[model samples]
Target: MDPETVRIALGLEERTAAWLTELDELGPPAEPVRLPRGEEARDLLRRLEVPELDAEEIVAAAPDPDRDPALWWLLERTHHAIVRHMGDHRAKPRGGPPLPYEGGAAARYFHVYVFLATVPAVRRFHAERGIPDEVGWETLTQLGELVAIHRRKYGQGGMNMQWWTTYHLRGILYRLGRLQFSLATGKDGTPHLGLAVPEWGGPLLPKAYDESLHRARPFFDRHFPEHGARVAWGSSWMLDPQLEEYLTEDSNIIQLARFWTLTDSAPEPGNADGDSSILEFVFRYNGQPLDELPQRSSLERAVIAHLKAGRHWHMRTGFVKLP
Candidate 1:
């Protein structure tokens, strides 16, 4: 694995090629990662429920996780960044040496391999804490759901949620039924739970929401008892109150919004991205021609109409007491 090998592996262009030599001075990983091979890779993908198309492509393009200098460096560097912030959900994994790949492009399945490398740490952490295997399994399998979302957006055959998965890899997030929960320190500096709406959960029905929360209570109590958390916080473009005008009260999102007590932390600069976020999150669309975008649902219509009216959507931050 020489500099030339890395450059070719990563498709480094003229400017970015210089960074290859810099990786040498940046030092090596504490340990090299070895990805599963042959049937093991297939078995792992099946267990995770990854889409067959993407899963088979992953197997087909299997690179030497450690022997390939570019991937090994990315894997080690990303893994170290994730492990360092394992329990601190507030800390984000920093984007290391920028690669020429953009708009979610990377080496074939490199993102998956890099993220898969972090599994051992999460598994070991869960095992040491006596967390239920079912809980760990459900959380880890979320990788498959995210992969499907990636497919929908780009029709590409790998994952792009490396940053989001850091929460899972660090033992800070879990998939409880239709929702994902994350742990973080509140503004008051205590253990806090947060909600993330999954891309594919069937519906945000109250019954299902209650069931997820009920499951989380004792599980967090057993595994993480220090904070005595009673509330969960969240910030999402979907929570914008203006949506009520466009959505019926019985709508799942509207009903779900009623559960939160909106905080004053509205109108953040991120509000500007809310329109695009709505398009991306709801429709899995990240393309041009907003006017031509499909409007098959009330939510979809609202997303486009609101923007057409020159009014803007916003991300709202709010909290609800645990059920």
Candidate 2:
């Protein structure tokens, strides 16, 4: 039988459909069917037209205590399906650039789904904490602008841009929540604002990073209500103490940072390249002596030591923060 016909016969289509239906009904998710590796699984994944995954592997990795193992697998698969469907609409058939080295199409769409799925939960978290939902539709509007630029420049291939725009959108909201509480009550509260390696070349390129901060600044200004402060970027090897306690594994901050590092270059920086590392700017902005700061990990120290050893970096033109 043709793969398409076999896939339908095996009820692969039903898996995602049923899973989504359950998600709609349960406001979370329900367990999904498990299919073994073979033509059936391949055909099913192909027919579903979603990013493929090993269901068993996904179940094993899921850390959601409130969710059944199969439910986590289903939720992840379903999220992928939605992102692919959405991204395909933005690119040509079997077309679009390859995804970033870190996360391809799956990661791109995963953040989109994260925003859509978790808005309510995030909003509720704010309400319960007595914080305003400063992150309104504006975040999505800014993200759409970046996506449009990416689609025009590279079609579906600029997955890194797409991924980071969403990452920052979620970051803006998460950070705004913290900023609101901190500014109002005067407490030592902060969100996980650290930069990771994937972000440097991928989303945090000087120009793009600056633009993201520009877009995010207004959210902070409008929400802080009582006072405004300039937001500076920094990084750490460990998750922020507050983030570790409050955010779950599936939270966007955690998911996006899962593979991030303070050091380690994807395209590996070179001295001859003459491009200044973003870390230099980060250190300059924070006024911390780069050499004096304790090296949290060997990788972190390695990158810093390399930058100081004369691997130059450059910021994109018109790099400025919003006042």
Candidate 3:
């Protein structure tokens, strides 16, 4: 499909038209680009004529295209093109400097929220209509596989610390939502099935998980309007069995109580350091302290404390600092 047609079908407005226009020019590269980190990688993208992108604009433009096979193909094609361009090609045995996933400027410019979000939304659309959506399921499954494969291939030694932390948080949130939904409805709770990587597996890394959450937010809001409070509460109840009873079909009071417990357990400034610590405090308040809380650095503690207290904290490390 042409850029204009893809834009309108995807519910994108004028702000993102130019982005798709340039993306159309990016066919699969014969060989992956082996650019260095920082300005050099960005300069490569500019020289290659890749267009700058606004993440928010692309996110806002993503539409639930239902089971339209053409739209799905378009999205898949774009994803492959990006992978070809961004995949690291340096040989490891030669001790060549590897491309840094954390500081590459092109990494900041390219966001996968659109593809991650759109896949699930499309699956939901077909599901509600009793139409088969195996392609959608496969797309999500492949995405998770790709994430795991890329991480393993690139090696995790170069990952930014905070990036790894938030990756855990977002993956935890997504899994919690799926788990609760399954418990509440007695249906399959996985986002994708028949993948070698299990549903709760760490296929969706931190940033991808965050973007997936953002995209799925509207889908949940539209489909299960009454579950908003439960959803928010469940986010705080990650893996705490004390909250399990609340997920039962007839446990409205239990659900409400869990929600209230979360509200009452809100972090006090000096009480919790990171989002995980706040989660620990909540669990303790509810009489279920988890044993897996990781030790944090001073800056991590500060950011966590700031976030728990409803304040903003941005990382000075030039990594994408997510809320």
Candidate 4:
């Protein structure tokens, strides 16, 4: 890795073993990396249907391909590593241990060009498997929603979903319908399917979810028969068992929760992540003084009541049998 790029990308003033080790394994690509700029970059973003403001920010942040050695080198490595593993199931790209990132311009938008850079390659990967161009593009275009999420949380146009989007940039994760599914290996080393909530979608109602899962069954059977995942695993603050206490029996959340087999969450019962998840999802912010939290809905009211009693909400886990 280029030293300057290493420093910028790792958010470190000096090198450390962790980042070096991660990059060492990924190694360097045999060629240079080029990021689009000017009207060309804008055109590419337009094709993906990235949000107006976020697209402008991403385009503006594009490094001059002829200069900014650090950005180009970092993009070169990230792009190559992600593309290198698109179909190589045995050698998956991992996020590794979290490196020291202080969140500067590099952290804010490095992923933009990386995703933009790999679109063509990922399309080829999908095509090799008879995946439709529409499906490939739709799955990749979800970056628009991710950038929107960053805008929602920071009032800005960069996505912090850098690593999370890697799966989509590769071919591991797919958007079959309204829901997202990931082929994954379980903790015990068995292959399974993982579920993720999108930044924008309809409510977690039974009908939409059932259709998504139903489509997913055949999508995987055709594309990834090797997985043979018999179950779909999910974990989120939304899965917290306690939601039943506050939501009515026939509520959407309750209906959804009842379908999944409840499983363990964090060992610590008092984990506060559930509160943060709720606040972020419902109110668009977190860490605010609880007294001032908005209570426009019953769910918001339920979240507040627990904290007011000094009880912490927990992130929970669950799974459903795949048909």
Candidate 5:
């Protein structure tokens, strides 16, 4: 396909999908004089054969307990925001020039999506009360602050734009999951620990945790072999300056500060009876001959595989709260 055609097709599909998504969220427009959602948004997707493509099976791939309409909407909006930030620029596949598009409105919309989608985990705090999974205005406001921080620090570096985008997206999703849990359980509390690490047990278990970390480690090893064995936890309390420095441009990190707390409530210390328990082991790194330390890949692969196979719980046990 011609590059221009590809660009046009993608642009149109994204815009249409975006508008439909908005309608889903806000309902129909209010003013008497209305407008079509826009051609680029409408025809672009079909023209590009997006339907033929296999969409990411997010729900099935990882059936998170807090999955709901509100959560889904937030995720989609967040994803769209990231795409819009990239604009129409075709820069290098991974790192390249920012694809500049006419009229800065697209970028503005991108920012809008990011801000709206970044609401914190109010859902988790009020879950038992049957609170609707709506993103509170305050949460949205908080997200805006994060966006501002990123925009100031790295938005100009188009070369690493994709990575930064992933960084923000990862943090947002991690928070979203925890917040929804809180809403369901009436614990709408904030994550106190800065960069909390994932624990090892629970009903979700070694299996669930293993599954998540296993998928994540390959990506980490490829991008950050040096830090392959080290775990990077998430944190809302870490001052922005500290977070900025800790989250270096070169590291491969996965943060669970909020979710970590939620999952660590096992009946016994270091035991969740295959339900939930805390376990922290970062890949070892030393400035020496490469082979001297434990084989990072082997260690990660072995530990994760053991967890997946249900052998990790023998190390500890406890009762978890679950219906």
Candidate 6:
């Protein structure tokens, strides 16, 4: 195994040991970890401890690195479930162009949300480090554009944008949280010269997890109508192979792999009223017709929803309306 993996295993072993000690001393302790101050923390921790949380169940409860490794693994499984929910079973071995599995509405929605969330973290990083928020946003925007181009040209698949954006976004949040936590707790969560997530610190390091979730909720709610429909259709394909085959063959599924990035000055007239301008990027596939299943409408809805979601959750970072 790699060094990071080894370190994670070690951390788990140590934490597990500590947990066992607690159980022994307190007689199957009522709670796993001490609750952080704040009503939100109390609420979140209460939800985390249940009479019966399977290894996977706990991870899904809090999909952060600070959570037990077992939990992150569970969250990964859930993510895959979401991906499967969005595509046909026989979707090509993942990669190249857009299929329902590749560039379909689900994938598009997922990427859009993940990308939108990145803005806040990036903005916060800029402000904290004395970097101009607009300059940082522009730089980050360019990076996002570059990635979209890379995704289309290379046809890479499997949560490509989500993974990339999540990593960098989390990295910034991780650093910010570390700085904040160190100030308050006097504990250093930053990984040493070389270490992976577990070494980076626990849920404590990403202080904004609750904030992000709250912000994301409204956005998610706004898209509820279409999101409901697509998720339903996507789930149907997962249960029936014949349905999958039929959908793949007759669905007029056209994957568009080529698209243009919004120009630096692209006017987001929608954001003109003090609302945060939606950070939009499109990855269009040329082979498939995106509009066939009302997904085009769904995609448009999702893009707007994503922007609203981020702003709802992280307006402190920035959300400007374009005039």
TM-score of each: 0.86, 0.29, 0.24, 0.86, 0.23, 0.22
Ranking by lDDT: 1, 4, 2, 3, 5, 6
At residue 235, candidate 6 shows an lDDT of 11
Q: Pick the winner on lDDT between candidates 1 and 5.
A: 1
Q: Which stretches of candidate 5 lie over 4 Å from their true place?
A: 1-6, 9-103, 114-135, 154-323
Model 6 TM-score?
0.22
Model-by-model lDDT, in order?
A: 0.74, 0.35, 0.33, 0.73, 0.29, 0.28
**Displacement of the residue 37 alpha carbon in candidate 6, Å:** 34
Residue 68, candidate 1: Cα error in Å is 3.0
Please report the TM-score between candidate 1 and the true structure. Answer: 0.86
Residue 93 lDDT (model 5): 22
Per-residue C-alpha lDDT of model 5 across residues 155-200, encoded as one tens digit per residue: 4211113333332323222222112111011124322111222211
lDDT: the better of candidates 3 and 6: 3
RMSD (CA, angstroms), candidate 6: 21.8
- Candidate 3 lDDT, tens digit per residue, 1-323? 67777666545557766656666676423432221334543443233222333222223333233544334434444444433322121111111111233423222222232234233333444355343343224323333333333333343212112221122112111222222111122123322110011233343344444554344445444543443422322232232333342235343323333322232343443443344433433222223322332335332343345444565321110011112
Misplaced by over 4 Å in model 2 are: 1-110, 129-135, 157-312, 315-323
Runs of candidate 1 with Cα error greater than 4 angstroms are 1-31, 65-67, 95-106, 265-271
Q: Among these predicted structures, which one has the highest lDDT?
A: 1
Model 4, TM vs. native: 0.86
> Residue 181's C-alpha lDDT in candidate 1?
84
The global Cα lDDT (0 to 1) of model 3 is 0.33
After superposition, the stretches of candidate 3 with alpha carbons farther than 4 Å from their true spots are: 27-69, 89-323
